[PDB]
């Protein structure tokens, strides 16, 4: 176990001792997310990297780890490290798909349902006493929301999560209707869902969920053009990333009823501060919490472990995101 | 259109013009719930009524009603109505079944997942700047949730709501367990749903859903005894009524950790106010809006119509309570 690996957060410690076995591990514990400064230095001879979404793994730090072969993201996520800079040095990536899916699909619905029924503000009402101080038990318009069964969702990326979400809209007795990158007719015959180009499917849609990775042709996807496309009585989900939506654009278009509401789990800045975005009651917010679940936490742990162990042994690791890197330099330290 | 109908609350329109043109209509529009002494002095001359929960239609109401042949709930539930006492009078009691399932059981997933996955709390936090301010991005350990995709729930009333519920469970590839007064092999067979004893059901679920109406014999149904029965990680939902559950026993078992959440829509008062309750974060309480869907309220209104429009007709109401009624007068005024 001569390895060495550094881990940037305190991951759940199935992962951890999976590690310990195989590889010298340090793991940063402090409140906050390890400073740039700090992360150069820790860097400059390890064997392996565990990193978050919050560590930029670009050039300047490949520059500054001359020993690192292969770094794990604890993420599905990995707009967050410079691939092709890794690639070309032969550094494998790795990231931790599939182990957190249902985990984000259920965080999904539970923005798309609690943005859709006005779950918060409810909350908030009863909560703080105002519904009783007020003495009003029950009014025909409060907390009007809208329908979900039966209704239409429109997924934007269907892949692992896109699917997820889907199948958990066939329970729901949802019209399903998906723009995507590749179309997948299998999913389309399985879950009778109907492939659109992204105008229609924001015209025809009473929930837009995005669950697509970040990159060039992403960003800022859902700008003002697009939601003036979707329907006055449609609510848009984000589980995804938060550049994928302008959200200068979005605000301004809740704030004059262009769209009906919005659930967001991710921002353009994390942690991120919006006055004019927290002021508005249609509006659901989540930390970026999508795949905290007990469940997702372990798997992912379990997986970036698998990935670093597969490695040392001089193995493809499992979930390799830049598989031309093989040809580049074989597996191992 | 010689009948007079008095309306309790300010119902959709759509329901309220139906009956203009068969009766001579007089609708509630106060901000606060009628007066038990205004309620006493409209209802002397009115050949019909339409109520909602909040009015108890007992039997100093009826001796006070002379005229009273019809009573329109628009509600589902019924418990507010001492039917006993109006079918002896020949009075017929109809409620709003179906029309508003699916809001409810939309809303009791979305109970369900947003105390599943702290969506309540991590909204607080966001908005509030708290996340900003505190300048931390990301903790593994922040609003870790429990799963909810494969895993076991357990609903308490197979009926209208409990059925929209499993049908919604299936689509998290839930483990369907319930408990029910009438057992439904068929849907048994449909849904690959399991019948348990109570107390078997309360073992083995991870998420307890109410869906059953109250009456005697479900008054505190979920006591200290069976909270104790629970998992410790298992989330209670009540879409149901609120004297189905012991709140002062699910205030203990939430403090002393018996089990891990609640999710309430429905209270013993409403309004209500419990401090208590209000400071713990692992419960999510919304104002009695499970059938508050614009789909939902418009069908309640024109159910109400067509009932009472059915019976000025001479036919039998399409949602009849109390059939026995037909046998002791036949329907009309
Ligand atoms: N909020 C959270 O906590 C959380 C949790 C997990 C993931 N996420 C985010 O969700 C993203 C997706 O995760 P996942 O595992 O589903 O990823 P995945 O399986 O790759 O799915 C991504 C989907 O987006 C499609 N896509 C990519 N670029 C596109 C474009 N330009 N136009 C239309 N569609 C495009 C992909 O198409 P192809 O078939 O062509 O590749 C695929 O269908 C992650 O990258 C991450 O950003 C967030
Ligand atoms: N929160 C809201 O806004 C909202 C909205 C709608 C309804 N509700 C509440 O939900 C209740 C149910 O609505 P729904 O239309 O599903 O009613 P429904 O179809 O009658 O369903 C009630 C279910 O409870 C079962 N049940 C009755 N007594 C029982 C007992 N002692 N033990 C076990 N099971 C028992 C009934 O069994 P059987 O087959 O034997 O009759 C039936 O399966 C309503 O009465 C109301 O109180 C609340």
Redesign the interface.
Same mark, same amino acid.
């Given at each position: 176990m001569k390895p060495k690996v550094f881990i940037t957060?305190?991951?759940?410690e199935v992962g951890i001792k999976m590690l310990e076995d195989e590889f010298e591990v340090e793991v940063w514990g402090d409140?906050?997310?390890i400073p740039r400064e700090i992360l150069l230095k820790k860097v400059k001879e390890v064997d392996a990297l565990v990193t978050?979404?919050?560590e930029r793994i670009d050039k300047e730090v490949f520059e500054n780890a001359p020993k690192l072969r292969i770094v794990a993201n604890y993420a599905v996520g990995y707009d967050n490290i410079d691939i092709e800079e890794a690639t070309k040095r032969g550094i494998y990536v790795t990231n931790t798909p599939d182990v957190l899916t249902?985990?984000t699909?259920? *965080?999904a619905?539970? *923005?798309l349902? #609690?943005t #859709?029924? @006005?779950?918060?503000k409810?909350?908030r009402?009863?909560?703080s /006493?105002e519904?009783?101080?007020? /003495? $009003?038990?029950? @009014?025909?318009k409060?907390?009007? /929301?809208?329908? $979900?069964? %039966?209704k239409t969702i429109g997924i934007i990326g269907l892949g692992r999560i896109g699917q997820?979400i889907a199948?958990?809209?066939? %329970?729901?007795?949802m019209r399903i209707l998906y723009y995507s990158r590749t179309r997948k007719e299998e999913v389309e015959r399985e879950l009778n869902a109907e492939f659109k180009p992204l105008e229609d499917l924001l015209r025809e849609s009473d929930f837009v969920v995005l669950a697509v990775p970040l990159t060039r042709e992403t960003y800022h996807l859902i700008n003002e053009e697009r939601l003036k496309l979707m329907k006055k009585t449609a609510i848009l989900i984000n589980i995804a990333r938060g550049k994928v939506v302008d959200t200068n654009a979005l605000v301004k278009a809740l704030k004059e009823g262009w769209i009906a509401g919005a659930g967001l789990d991710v921002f353009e800045e994390?942690?991120?501060?919006n006055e004019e975005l927290?002021k508005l009651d249609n509006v659901?917010?989540?930390? @970026?919490?999508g795949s905290?679940?007990? %469940?997702?936490?372990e798997g992912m742990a379990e997986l970036v472990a698998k990935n670093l162990i597969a490695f040392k042994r001089g193995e493809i690791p499992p979930t390799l995101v830049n598989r031309e890197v093989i040809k580049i330099r074989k597996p191992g330290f």
């Open positions: 957060r305190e991951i759940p409140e906050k997310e978050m979404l919050s249902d985990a699909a259920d *965080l619905f539970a *923005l349902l #609690a #859709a029924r @006005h779950v918060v409810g909350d009402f009863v909560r /006493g519904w009783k101080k007020r /003495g $009003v038990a029950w @009014h025909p409060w907390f009007l /929301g809208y329908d $979900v069964y %039966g997820a199948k958990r809209a066939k %329970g729901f007795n994390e942690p991120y501060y927290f659901v917010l989540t930390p @970026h919490i905290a679940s007990f %469940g997702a936490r």
